[PDB]
Amino acid sequence: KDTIALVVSTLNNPFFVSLKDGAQKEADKLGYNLVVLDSQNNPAKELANVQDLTVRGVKILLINPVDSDAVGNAVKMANQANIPVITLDRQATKGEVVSHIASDNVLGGKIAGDYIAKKAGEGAKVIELQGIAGTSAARERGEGFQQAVAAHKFNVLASQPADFDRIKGLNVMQNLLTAHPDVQAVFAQNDEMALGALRALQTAGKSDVMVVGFDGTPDGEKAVNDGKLAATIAQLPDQIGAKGVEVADKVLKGEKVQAKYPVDLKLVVKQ
């Protein structure tokens, strides 16, 4: 079997476990060996892993950067080895990349803000919990949300990163609530942060504050159905993973591959 490598930012997040599962299923179907290396949200690890894979002479690198700015040197190493690179979910700011497969995260952030305007109103007092700085996902969601802040004249009380992490989201939101008890709505750039924020708000007696997440993870979907999470923006991580392999196969066969394969997003609310 030929080997495709998948270098994933972390497997401590259900979104990325699903991404890996889609890649694996597709690899199995197309007859490739898939080597999955977990970067553990660590730029040093990501670099070591890519170096290892380039010396193993993998045929294609699928990479979900830890940091879109920091991954340039890892990608240049694959470039020097003539191993084509396909980015999944997050972009590489520098380096040669054959194809990028991700959600329209600008649109996602706009959709999230637009729903907050629908339910909390024009001029709502909002807090944004940002993802990992340096990731195109967080940057784009922030851009999309700012479009909503402008459109609907939101009062942004605070916008701070909680690193796509549930516990950080809890600690950051707890902290922000003390400064800004008048918050009316929160946009958390993933469901893990959203669920942390929800826990901080319940603790402070502010469970009336509307929260919108991102990803539509099983825990996000459950939280919507339970009435705790106002909404989430559903992504299709299995499809991002699968497409990565499908395009890797294409590249290897010399077929023409798009520079970008956008993957659909969907506002999810309780039915």
Ligand X SMILES: O[C@@H]1[C@H](O)[C@H](O)CO[C@H]1O
Q: How far is the CB of 128 from ligand X (least distance, A)?
A: 14
User: How many residues belong to the site for ligand X (CB under 6 A)?
Assistant: 12
163 makes contact with ligand X (CB under 6 A): no
Buried b or exposed e, range 220-253, using 16+ CB within 10 angstroms:
bbebbeeebbbbbbbbbbbbbbbbbbbbbbbbee
Rounded CA-CA distance 127/53 in Å is 41
Residue 166 or residue 184: which is nearer to ligand X going by CB? Answer: 166
**In the bound complex, which residue of the shown chain has the CB atom lying closest to ligand X?**
137
Rounded CA-CA distance 97/78 in Å is 10
15 makes contact with ligand X (CB under 6 A): yes
Residue 131 or residue 161: which is nearer to ligand X going by CB? Answer: 131
Select the residue interacting with ligand X from 214, 224, 241, 243 (CB under 6 A): 214
Rounded CA-CA distance 132/254 in Å is 35
Count, residues in the chain: 271
Residue 89 or residue 219: which is nearer to ligand X going by CB? Answer: 89
Rounded CA-CA distance 49/204 in Å is 42
H-type alpha helices, the chain: 14-30, 43-55, 72-80, 105-120, 136-151, 166-179, 191-204, 218-225, 237-253
User: Restricting to residues 82-121, which ones interact with ligand X according to CB under 6 A?
Assistant: 89-90
Q: How far is the CB of 221 from ligand X (least distance, A)?
A: 14
Residue 109 or residue 249: which is nearer to ligand X going by CB? Answer: 109
Using the structure block, give the residue that is written with the tokens 């949200």: 41
Q: Draw the binding track, 26-65, toward ligand X (x: CB under 6 A; -: no contact).
A: ----------------------------------------
Residue 54 or residue 75: which is nearer to ligand X going by CB? Answer: 75
Burial of 23 (0-12, 13-18, 19+ CB in 10 A): buried
Rounded CA-CA distance 154/204 in Å is 23
Residue 32 or residue 70: which is nearer to ligand X going by CB? Answer: 70
215 makes contact with ligand X (CB under 6 A): yes
Q: How far is the CB of 179 from ligand X (least distance, A)?
A: 25
Q: Are residues 10 and 64 in contact, defined by beta-carbon separation less than 8 angstroms?
A: no
Q: Which residues bind ligand X (CB under 6 A)?
A: 13, 15, 89-90, 131, 135, 137, 164, 190, 214-215, 235
